[PDB]
C-alpha cells in the first residue's frame, strides 16, 4: 500500500518501517523496493523490512545498494545474516565509492566474532564512518576480535564512539586497548 502511492510520498526524507517483522514473505518486500528506488533515493536514510531468513533477500537488496549514496545511515538491521556475509557486503562496499556515512546500524544478525574478524578486513577502509554498533544475538566469548579491532582502530578516524549492543563477552586485557574513542557496553 505504501508502495502504490510512494511517488507522492517522495516528499518524505523518512518512511520508517524498520525493526519490523511483516507477516509473510517480509524479505520479499525488497523486490517491491527495487521497483521503487527512483523515489527511494529521496529518503535520507535506509530502512529495511526484515523477517525470518530475511538475509536470503540480500542479492535482491544489491540492486538497491547502488542507492547507498543518499543514505544517512546504513544497515542490515535485524537481518539474520550469514556469519561470512558481513565481509561479503564489505566486498560490494570495496566496490563502492561512497564515503563518510554517520552510523552503521546492524541490529543483531547471526554474525559471530569470527565473522566480524573477516569484516575487519573491510572496516578499516571505512574509517570515515562516524558511528557504529555491532550486534549479534549470541556472541562468541572471544576478545581476539577486539584485538583485531585495535588493528582497525589505528586505521579509524571520525569515530566518536564504539557501541557493543548485545555482546555478552569479556574484553580481557585487550580492554586496555579497547578503543581510542568512547565506549558503551550497549
Partner 1 sequence: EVSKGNSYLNKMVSISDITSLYGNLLLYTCGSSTEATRAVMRHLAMVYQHGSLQGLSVTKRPLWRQESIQSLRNTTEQDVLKAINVNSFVECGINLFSESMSKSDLSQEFEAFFQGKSLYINSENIPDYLFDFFEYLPNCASALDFVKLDFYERATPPRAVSLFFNWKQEFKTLEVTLRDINKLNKQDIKYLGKIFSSATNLRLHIKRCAAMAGRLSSVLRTCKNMHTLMVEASPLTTDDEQYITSVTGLQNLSIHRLHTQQLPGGLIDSLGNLKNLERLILDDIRMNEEDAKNLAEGLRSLKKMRLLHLTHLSDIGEGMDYIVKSLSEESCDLQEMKLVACCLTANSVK
| Nearer Cβ to partner 1 (68/150) | 150
> Closest approach of Cβ 160 to partner 1, in Å?
22
> Closest approach of Cβ 147 to partner 1, in Å?
5
Interatomic CA distance for residues 154 and 123, integer angstroms: 12
- Cell representation of residue 91: 566486498
> Closest approach of Cβ 112 to partner 1, in Å?
15
| Strand order across the beta sheet in which 131-136 lies | 73-74, 103-109, 131-136, 161-163, 182-184
> Closest approach of Cβ 101 to partner 1, in Å?
25
| Nearer Cβ to partner 1 (95/176) | 176
| Nearer Cβ to partner 1 (36/148) | 148
Site residues for partner 1, 139-158, by CB under 8 A, read 144, 147-148, 150-151, 154
Closest CA relative to residue 148, chosen from 182, 104, 173, 113: 113
Asked if 169 interacts with partner 1 (CB under 8 A), we say: no
> Closest approach of Cβ 186 to partner 1, in Å?
24
Q: What is the DSSP string of 107-170?
A: EEES--HHHHHHHHHHHGGGTT--EEEEEESS--S--HHHHHHHHHHHH--S--EEE-TT----
Q: What is the CA radius of gyration of the chain?
A: 17
Interatomic CA distance for residues 4 and 160, integer angstroms: 40
| Nearer Cβ to partner 1 (38/141) | 141
- Contact code string over 105-144 relative to partner 1, x by CB under 8 A: ---------------------------------------x
Interface positions with partner 1 (CB under 8 A): 144, 147-148, 150-151, 154, 172-174, 176-177
Amino acid at each position: 500500500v505504501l508502495a502504490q502511492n510512494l511517488h507522492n510520498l517522495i516528499k518524505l526524507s523518512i518512511l520508517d518501517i524498520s525493526e519490523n517483522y511483516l507477516e509473510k514473505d517480509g524479505n520479499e518486500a525488497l523486490q517491491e523496493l527495487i521497483g521503487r528506488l527512483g523515489v527511494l533515493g529521496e529518503l535520507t536514510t535506509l530502512m529495511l523490512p526484515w523477517c525470518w531468513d530475511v538475509h536470503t533477500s540480500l542479492p535482491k537488496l544489491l540492486k538497491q545498494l547502488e542507492g547507498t549514496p543518499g543514505l544517512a545511515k546504513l544497515g542490515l538491521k535485524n537481518w539474520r545474516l550469514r556469519d561470512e556475509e558481513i565481509k561479503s557486503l564489505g566486498e560490494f562496499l570495496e566496490m563502492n565509492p561512497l564515503r563518510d556515512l554517520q552510523q552503521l546500524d546492524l541490529a543483531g544478525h547471526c554474525v559471530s566474532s569470527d565473522g566480524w574478524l573477516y569484516f575487519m578486513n573491510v572496516f578499516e577502509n571505512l574509517k570515515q564512518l562516524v558511528f557504529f554498533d555491532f550486534s549479534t544475538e549470541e556472541f562468541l566469548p572471544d576478545a581476539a576480535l577486539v584485538r583485531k579491532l585495535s588493528q582497525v582502530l589505528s586505521k579509524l578516524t571520525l569515530l566518536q564512539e564504539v557501541k557493543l549492543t548485545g555482546w555478552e563477552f569479556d574484553d580481557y586485557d585487550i580492554s586496555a586497548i579497547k578503543g581510542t574513542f568512547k565506549l558503551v557496553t550497549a
